[PDB]
Amino acid sequence: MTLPAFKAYDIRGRVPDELNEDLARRIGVALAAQLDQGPVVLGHDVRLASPALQEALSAGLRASGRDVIDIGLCGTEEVYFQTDYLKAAGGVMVTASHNPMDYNGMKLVREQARPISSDTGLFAIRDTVAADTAAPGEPTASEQSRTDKTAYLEHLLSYVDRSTLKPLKLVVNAGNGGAGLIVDLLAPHLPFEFVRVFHEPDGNFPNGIPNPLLPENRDATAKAVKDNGADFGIAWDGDFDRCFFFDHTGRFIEGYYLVGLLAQAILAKQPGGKVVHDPRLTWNTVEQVEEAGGIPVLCKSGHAFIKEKMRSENAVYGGEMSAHHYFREFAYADSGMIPWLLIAELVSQSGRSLADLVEARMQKFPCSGEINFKVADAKASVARVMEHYASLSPELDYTDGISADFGQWRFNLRSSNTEPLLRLNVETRGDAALLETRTQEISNLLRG
Ligand SMILES: O=P(O)(O)OC[C@H]1O[C@H](O)[C@@H](O)[C@@H](O)[C@@H]1O
Ligand SMILES: [Mg+2]
């Protein structure tokens, strides 16, 4: 067999049987042979095993002659930013994002923070590690500590005109991950009042693993918004590359609608630019990008595909509905921080609440939310759906699973790249009844 921790886009496994310091050191050795020349940036999240796994990575890297830039406890986007900003050969973030307590993992990038994925070097690294029985060498290169966040913070602040910001009251919920540290470093340069929930970094996760999609964790942000009269709330996953928004009523806003909203925010600053979007939910983004004078670019979901397409298109912004937002000047990388700064600026400048910024769009293109299915036979289940709707001759697109456009409604149905599940998304042209009846009909077919 093969090491189960090596996934399509990152390394993730239970410590210590699927991921451990020995494996981490071997990954450092193998990564060194995969990169162009230059040093390697290393950062890590709040999980208890993360520092030890990083040190092991560092040892393997340095045994292979790679200088190491240790940026310390950070978010994933800081590994992306520093890798590009410092013109490093590559970078590794030790993190398990939102996964349970007994899990860890790694996100690996090369020059300009370009992703290393299963077909772009990650499985080559796996196979090297799998067969490596060599005695560990000793370090022949140095590790430097580089925790200065100044350039990163300045880059974040450059997306907004600070003189236009209003003293909004913002709930922030780091979920005991790492986001609160960046919020607190940004706070002296911003007029906002922060209502801090689950703010302190704690890899024991006393308040639950950092996953804002869990309704119990969602409700902590919503309650703090409602109880404090906040303008809106923001939650993050543990490594804060994903951000989740709550309007002033406590309502969680589906990530889909943030894509069109952030695209309009960006296009005000970069007129005529291209905007990359995923195929799961599309109609609202296409319309809002076009209305704002931008050009929408359909792309397969997954950060590797999104970033590749943004690069080839010189795209100014890209967004998925899975709460990842990507910015050209941010090394084409995703940030959980840039989005809420932009939304705070848009609320401040427009005098509109976040709720009203999205309300008409939610009414115009209502969506099911992403619904996941673990079925006995995904392929037969998808076939059963397609056969049922064949007589309506939908317009079919195979960018990412199957997208079917029926005119007044459409769906996307695809296998996940991170779990063994089918993911369904449905949307309609302003028709909530058609949305529910078609969603339920597809669900029944899938469960057949
Ligand atoms: O729906 P999927 O394939 O499980 O991916 C969901 C998300 O996983 C990761 O967070 C990233 O790779 C995202 O780019 C992706 O959208
Ligand atoms: Mg994450």
Side-chain angles (χ1 to χ4, degrees), residues 1-386 388-448:
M1 51 202 72
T2 56
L3 287 165
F6 285 80
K7 314 289 178 173
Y9 295 104
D10 52 13
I11 305 177
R12 316 186 298 270
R14 188 179 337 105
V15 172
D17 54 308
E18 301 177 326
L19 183 51
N20 53 57
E21 298 170 44
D22 178 11
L23 283 168
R25 185 195 51 67
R26 284 188 269 156
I27 291 159
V29 173
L31 176 61
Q34 293 292 323
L35 297 174
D36 279 46
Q37 307 283 67
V40 179
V41 166
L42 299 180
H44 64 267
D45 78 358
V46 301
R47 287 166 190 270
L48 281 325
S50 298
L53 292 170
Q54 186 184 307
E55 296 294 294
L57 265 171
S58 179
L61 285 164
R62 291 176 300 115
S64 318
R66 293 288 178 160
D67 291 326
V68 168
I69 302 160
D70 170 18
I71 72 172
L73 178 64
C74 64
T76 294
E77 75 195 65
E78 299 182 73
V79 165
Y80 299 158
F81 174 84
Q82 301 298 349
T83 295
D84 178 69
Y85 184 87
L86 305 171
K87 294 171 196 152
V92 187
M93 174 72 180
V94 180
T95 187
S97 199
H98 64 290
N99 281 98
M101 177 134 180
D102 58 330
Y103 275 73
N104 216 315
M106 305 174 180
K107 311 269 190 187
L108 291 71
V109 297
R110 52 178 316 124
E111 69 281 348
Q112 296 93 54
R114 293 167 184 269
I116 296 171
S117 304
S118 59
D119 66 315
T120 62
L122 186 59
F123 280 7
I125 287 171
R126 180 200 62 194
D127 300 341
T128 297
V129 168
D132 181 4
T133 59
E138 301 199 277
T140 60
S142 321
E143 187 186 272
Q144 295 121 289
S145 179
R146 204 282 193 175
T147 61
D148 182 24
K149 292 178 192 301
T150 296
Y152 168 66
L153 297 173
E154 293 185 22
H155 186 83
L156 293 183
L157 294 168
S158 73
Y159 287 81
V160 302
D161 182 338
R162 282 155 73 210
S163 75
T164 69
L165 302 177
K166 287 192 168 192
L168 303 181
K169 180 185 285 197
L170 304 180
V171 162
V172 293
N173 180 351
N176 307 108
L181 296 55
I182 298 311
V183 167
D184 289 349
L185 292 173
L186 288 170
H189 315 284
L190 302 165
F192 310 136
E193 192 195 307
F194 293 103
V195 174
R196 300 171 164 80
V197 176
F198 300 157
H199 190 76
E200 282 64 61
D202 190 340
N204 296 282
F205 302 113
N207 303 295
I209 54 177
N211 177 1
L213 294 183
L214 288 165
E216 13 132 316
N217 308 152
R218 175 199 64 187
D219 285 6
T221 313
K223 182 177 178 46
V225 171
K226 291 182 289 190
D227 289 356
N228 292 277
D231 294 278
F232 63 89
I234 316 129
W236 301 269
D237 67 348
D239 63 337
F240 66 94
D241 59 350
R242 287 185 295 154
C243 52
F244 305 83
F245 288 88
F246 295 77
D247 71 24
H248 76 274
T249 74
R251 181 178 58 177
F252 170 73
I253 305 305
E254 277 291 318
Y256 176 38
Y257 303 108
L258 269 295
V259 179
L261 191 55
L262 289 168
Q264 297 206 319
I266 291 292
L267 286 168
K269 307 166 185 289
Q270 293 266 350
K274 290 166 180 260
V275 172
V276 170
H277 65 86
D278 72 41
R280 302 162 169 124
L281 293 173
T282 60
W283 281 338
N284 181 72
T285 300
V286 171
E287 188 172 274
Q288 288 202 293
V289 168
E290 288 179 344
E291 288 191 10
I295 293 162
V297 178
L298 172 67
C299 183
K300 197 173 173 70
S301 78
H303 76 115
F305 296 98
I306 300 284
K307 291 160 173 168
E308 277 191 7
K309 179 72 71 171
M310 290 181 67
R311 282 192 159 96
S312 63
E313 296 280 345
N314 180 45
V316 66
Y317 163 75
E320 303 180 83
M321 67 163 292
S322 64
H324 288 269
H325 300 281
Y326 306 77
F327 303 90
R328 173 178 64 201
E329 298 316 316
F330 197 60
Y332 289 98
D334 39 329
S335 168
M337 294 288 156
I338 299 172
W340 70 267
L341 291 166
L342 287 174
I343 294 298
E345 183 185 47
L346 176 56
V347 170
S348 295
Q349 290 183 357
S350 71
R352 316 242 315 266
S353 73
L354 172 58
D356 202 61
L357 285 175
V358 301
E359 198 75 57
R361 308 312 298 177
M362 293 177 39
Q363 275 298 307
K364 191 173 185 180
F365 297 107
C367 69
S368 59
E370 184 165 84
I371 305 177
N372 299 311
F373 300 77
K374 191 198 191 179
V375 299
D377 190 334
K379 187 180 184 293
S381 294
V382 171
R384 208 163 39 241
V385 168
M386 302 315 300
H388 181 269
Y389 292 112
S391 64
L392 301 177
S393 55
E395 182 180 295
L396 301 175
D397 183 277
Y398 300 97
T399 297
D400 196 351
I402 300 180
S403 299
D405 188 334
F406 295 81
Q408 300 306 116
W409 70 284
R410 59 171 297 279
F411 71 82
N412 176 265
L413 182 58
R414 59 181 283 283
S415 290
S416 165
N417 289 323
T418 60
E419 320 179 45
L421 300 170
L422 281 170
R423 307 207 186 275
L424 173 66
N425 285 284
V426 187
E427 60 176 332
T428 74
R429 297 193 183 272
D431 190 340
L434 181 67
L435 173 67
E436 174 74 347
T437 58
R438 291 305 191 191
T439 300
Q440 295 292 353
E441 186 175 52
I442 293 165
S443 298
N444 293 341
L445 290 164
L446 288 173
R447 298 294 189 182

